[PDB]
C-alpha cells in the first residue's frame, strides 16, 4: 500500500506532464499487481484506481503502470476516468 501510493503519485505526475494538467492526487481506491510471464522478460503491470480532485472536484481515475521486472527489485501506459 505504501509502495503502491508511490506508484500512484508517479501515474498522476505523468498524466499531468503528458497532458499539461493540474490533477490533485488523493489516494489509492483499488490496486492489483499482476506479474506477466508471457514473454522472455518478466514484467509487472499495476492496475490502479485512484481518486483525484479535478478543479477541486473528486473524481475516479483508472491507471496502468508498467514495471520492468519484479517490484521488490517504470512507465505510465494509460490514465482515464471510469
Amino acid at each position: 500500500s505504501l509502495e503502491i501510493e508511490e506508484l500512484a503519485r508517479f501515474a498522476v505526475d505523468e498524466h499531468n506532464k503528458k497532458e499539461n494538467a493540474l490533477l490533485e492526487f488523493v489516494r489509492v481506491v483499488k490496486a492489483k499487481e499482476q506479474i506477466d510471464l508471457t514473454q522472455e522478460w518478466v514484467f509487472t503491470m499495476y492496475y490502479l484506481t485512484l481518486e483525484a480532485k479535478d478543479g477541486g472536484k473528486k473524481k475516479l481515475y483508472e491507471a496502468k503502470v508498467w514495471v520492468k521486472g519484479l517490484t521488490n527489485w517504470k512507465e505510465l501506459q494509460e490514465f482515464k476516468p471510469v
Partner: protein
C-alpha cells in the same frame, strides 16, 4: 490472448499473488518468480493445485487450469 490465463498463488498468510502466464509454459517459471517476489526459497515451499502437488515440469494446460484459478503454497 486465449493462450494466456490469469492465475493466483494463495499463501496461508492470506497473501495472494497474481500471474499472467501462457498455458504451455512450465509452472516452474511461475514458482521461481513467486519465490523471488516474496523473498522465499524453493527448497522451503511446496505448491499444490486442487489438493495435489505440482511438478515444475507441469504446465497449466496439462493440469487443465483455467483463467482465475488458484495455486496454494505451503511451507515445506
Amino acid at each position: 490472448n486465449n493462450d494466456h490465463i490469469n492465475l493466483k498463488v494463495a499463501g496461508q498468510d492470506g497473501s495472494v499473488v497474481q500471474f499472467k502466464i501462457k498455458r504451455h509454459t512450465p509452472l516452474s517459471k511461475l514458482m521461481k518468480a513467486y519465490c523471488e517476489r516474496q523473498g522465499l526459497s524453493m527448497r522451503q515451499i511446496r505448491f499444490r493445485f486442487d489438493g495435489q502437488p505440482i511438478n515444475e515440469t507441469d504446465t497449466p494446460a496439462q493440469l487443465e487450469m483455467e483463467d482465475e484459478d488458484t495455486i496454494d503454497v505451503f511451507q515445506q
